[PDB]
């Protein structure tokens, strides 16, 4: 076959790129990292620099304490045994307080007090990382699109760990930290709420999740198909439409009767992905607070046959 542009044929390397300055405090940038020739086949080879200001210190140290708190709980569950630790790794779980403790903070350490401590470190880590996404954009003079998109993911995460437990009135509703246990929580949640497939916002959230795979398959394939015309230089195509953007638009126009622009396809992109967790968080927040049996709700809303 002809060249498909999925992996580069020739790598070139020059002086390391320290990045744009703008209003960035350059003292808070690291040096440049190594160049990975393995990554250079698919994307850029250069690693780093990374920016590490005040919110980054807060986020990383809080995130480290979250990860370390779970880790030491797993080593305790392993009985300090390195062979057992690796054998049972996916089976260990730091579990929320039992239902009889409600929202209180009185639960013992083994009985969910450690889960509260870890969750506090997680809360600080994630929210300080949100402010990091906002301020990194600010210092470069960029739009805040990344921080606002990330707020949709935080919305689902907040619903799962914080808002729905408070509305339900116990921490026991929250997700356990553990590989198989959070899967088991996911299955149990649907069984308790009478089949989550009949939650219409879960259905929408799936539609947007599939739509994200559809749209990125389309967009990624499109840009590679026009990459022979410089199509992946999307900002310059936005500033000065070339034949790459015109051929991309006409392919979809002739295929399905309408098309995007080089800017506006990224507006479809951001919203398609955002809507996954926006609708997701609504669907979960409604579950148990408003609808405790989604199949029966579906029967009463014309989407499942009556008994």
């Amino acid at each position: 076959a002809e060249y498909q542009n999925i992996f580069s044929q020739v790598q070139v390397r020059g002086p390391a790129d320290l990045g744009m300055t703008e209003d960035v405090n350059l003292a808070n940038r690291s040096g440049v990292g190594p160049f990975s020739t393995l990554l250079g086949w698919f994307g850029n080879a250069q690693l780093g620099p990374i920016y590490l200001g005040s919110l980054g210190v807060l986020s990383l140290f809080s995130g480290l304490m979250w990860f370390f708190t779970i880790g030491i709980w797993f080593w305790y569950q392993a009985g300090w045994n390195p062979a057992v630790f690796l054998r049972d790794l996916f089976f260990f779980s730091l579990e929320p307080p039992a239902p009889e403790y409600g929202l209180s903070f009185a639960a013992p350490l083994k009985e969910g007090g450690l889960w509260l401590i870890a969750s506090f470190f997680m809360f600080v880590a994630v929210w300080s990382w949100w402010g990091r996404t906002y301020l990194r954009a600010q210092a470069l003079g960029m739009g805040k699109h990344t921080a606002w998109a990330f707020l949709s993911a935080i919305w689902l995460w907040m619903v799962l760990g914080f808002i729905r437990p408070i509305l339900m009135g116990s921490w026991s509703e929250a997700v356990p930290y553990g590989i198989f246990s959070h899967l088991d929580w996911t299955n149990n949640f649907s069984l308790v709420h009478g089949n989550l497939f009949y939650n219409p916002f879960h259905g929408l959230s799936i539609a947007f999740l599939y739509g994200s795979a559809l749209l990125f398959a389309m967009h990624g394939a499109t840009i590679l198909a026009v990459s022979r015309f410089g199509g992946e230089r999307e900002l310059e195509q936005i500033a000065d439409r070339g034949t790459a953007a015109e051929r991309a638009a006409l392919f979809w126009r002739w295929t399905m009767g309408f098309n995007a622009t080089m800017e506006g396809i990224h507006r479809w992109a951001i919203w398609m992905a955002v809507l996954v967790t926006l609708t997701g968080g609504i669907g979960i927040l409604l579950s148990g607070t408003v609808v405790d049996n989604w199949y029966v709700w579906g029967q009463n809303h014309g989407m499942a046959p009556l008994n």
């Binding site: 003292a27 005040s54 210190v57 807060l58 140290f61 809080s62 304490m65 903070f105 009185a106 639960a107 013992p108 350490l109 007090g113 450690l114 509260l116 401590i117 506090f120 470190f121 600080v124």
Partner: protein, 55 residues
């Protein structure tokens, strides 16, 4: 001891006070949460039992 002041010649004081404030806040919350998880030291539950408010 007396020469510890030269720490500020190698570390930017902005970073140190941030990293220290972050550390102290997280440590303080962690210890208070440990005591709240500890039935013998949960001062809210202690005062409830002391004053017959647990009902």
């Amino acid at each position: 001891m007396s020469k510890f002041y030269k720490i500020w010649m190698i570390f930017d004081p902005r970073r140190v006070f941030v990293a220290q404030g972050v550390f102290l806040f997280l440590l303080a919350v962690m210890i208070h949460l440990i005591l709240l998880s500890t039935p013998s030291y949960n001062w809210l539950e202690i005062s409830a039992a002391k004053y017959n408010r647990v009902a």
